[PDB]
């Protein structure tokens, strides 16, 4: 048991599913507490990367809140050039380690920085958004409000992302207000949504914007 894992009872279910999180976990994958709670399970990340490499111009993608690299790794495996951004230097170190384990570190440029302040000066074909939702407690809300229950504010993250591109992918809680999420598209805006499942269990949603 890793120190983070042994330290807390609530991390036991993430450890149990370590291979659903990273298939190559035993090849030296590392995460911290928040990393465990937040990492996109591999099958879901692979699915999202597949859809992106299908329906969008897909050369350069910004992973704006890259965490431990769950999504970043999957984008890189499809051959997209990724700009991976996280405000936490520890996450960047973890993500860099995990990308190497998967043999695609060279496909990625890592930035420790605040996406909110970088966005206006970034250029890319696709922006992928997997922000903090407020830890595991996010689920205790009957309906997740992306404006009031998310920091940074979900509409603000989207507005800044729009400076970069119209092709935006938003990774969001399974109890997210779907009316709210859809409204991000604005007037006449295009949006398609999917529920992401792991073993027939509802996990999260992903919204695909632009065309
Ligand atoms: C808290 N959180 C969770 N996730 C993702 O959502 C998944 C499910 O997280 P979960 O916390 O809902 O677990 P479970 O699905 O086991 O549900 P629970 O016991 O009812 O609470 C995690 O595997 C992550 O992929 C998260 N993803 C992002 N991007 N940000 C987050 O803050 C975040
Ligand atoms: N303002 C900001 N800019 C960039 N990253 C931020 C940020 N605020 C928080 N973060 C980072 O956003 C991340 C949310 S969790 C991301 C998980 C990722 N999709 C995975 O697959 O692993 C956290 O790691 C947090 O450190």
For residue 29, report the distance from its CA to the centre of ligand 1, in Å: 19
For residue 43, report the distance from its CA to the centre of ligand 2, in Å: 19
Mutate which of 38, 69, 95 for ligand 1 pocket (most atoms within 8 A of beta carbon): 38
Distance CA 49, CA 56 (A): 10
| DSSP state letter for 28 | T
**Nearest CA-CA partner of 63 in 168, 182, 136:** 168
Atom of ligand 1 nearest to the CA of 44: 25
CA torsion sign for 121, 122, 125, 128 is negative
Q: What resolution in angstroms does the PDB record give?
A: 2.0
Atom of ligand 1 nearest to the CA of 70: 25
Mutate which of 43, 203, 205 for ligand 1 pocket (most atoms within 8 A of beta carbon): 203
For residue 172, report the distance from its CA to the centre of ligand 2, in Å: 13
- Name the burial class of residue 23, with classes exposed (0-12), middle (13-18) and buried (19+) by CB atoms within 10 angstroms of its CB: middle
DSSP-derived secondary structure for 176-192: B-HHHHHHTT-TT--EE
- Take atom 22 of ligand 2 and give the residue whose Cα is closest: 39
Decide: 41 in ligand 1 pocket, CB within 6 A: yes
The structure's method of determination equals X-ray
Going by their DSSP bridges, the two strands 191-198 and 201-209 should be labelled as: antiparallel
Going by their DSSP bridges, the two strands 108-112 and 168-173 should be labelled as: unpaired
Decide: 36 in ligand 1 pocket, CB within 6 A: no
- Name the burial class of residue 84, with classes exposed (0-12), middle (13-18) and buried (19+) by CB atoms within 10 angstroms of its CB: buried
Distance CA 182, CA 60 (A): 25
The helix/strand/coil state of 147 is coil
**Fold entry, domain 1-211:** Rossmann fold (3.40.50)
Decide: 38 in ligand 2 pocket, CB within 6 A: yes
Mutate which of 72, 86, 92 for ligand 2 pocket (most atoms within 8 A of beta carbon): 86
Residues 6+ apart with CB under 8 A from 157: 64, 115, 116, 129, 131
For residue 7, report the distance from its CA to the centre of ligand 2, in Å: 22
**Nearest CA-CA partner of 204 in 129, 148, 153:** 129
* Structure-derived torsion over alpha carbons of residues 28, 137, 86, 63, reported in degrees to the nearest 10: 90
174: number of Cβ within 10 Å? 15
The helix/strand/coil state of 207 is strand
- Name the burial class of residue 117, with classes exposed (0-12), middle (13-18) and buried (19+) by CB atoms within 10 angstroms of its CB: exposed
For residue 157, report the distance from its CA to the centre of ligand 2, in Å: 12
């Amino acid at each position: 048991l890793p120190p983070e894992i042994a330290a807390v009872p609530e991390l036991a279910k993430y450890w149990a599913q370590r291979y659903r999180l990273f298939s190559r976990f035993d090849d030296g994958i590392k995460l911290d507490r928040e990393g465990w709670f937040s990492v996109t399970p591999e099958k879901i990340a692979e699915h999202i990367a597949g859809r992106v490499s299908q329906s969008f111009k897909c050369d350069v993608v910004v992973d704006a809140f890259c965490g431990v690299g769950g999504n970043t790794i999957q984008f890189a495996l499809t051959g997209m050039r990724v700009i991976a951004i996280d405000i936490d230097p520890v996450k960047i170190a973890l993500a860099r380690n995990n990308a190497e384990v998967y043999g695609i570190a060279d496909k990625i440029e890592f930035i420790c920085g605040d996406f909110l302040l970088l966005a206006s000066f970034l250029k890319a074909d696709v922006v992928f958004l997997s922000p903090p939702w407020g830890g595991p407690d996010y689920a205790t809300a009957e309906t997740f409000d992306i404006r009031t229950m998310m920091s940074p504010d979900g509409f603000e993250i989207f507005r800044l992302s729009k400076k970069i591109t119209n092709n935006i992918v938003y990774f969001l809680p399974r109890n997210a207000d779907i009316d709210q999420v859809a409204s991000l598209a604005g007037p006449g805006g295009q949006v398609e949504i999917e529920q992401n499942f792991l073993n027939n269990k509802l996990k999260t949603i992903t919204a695909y914007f632009g065309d």
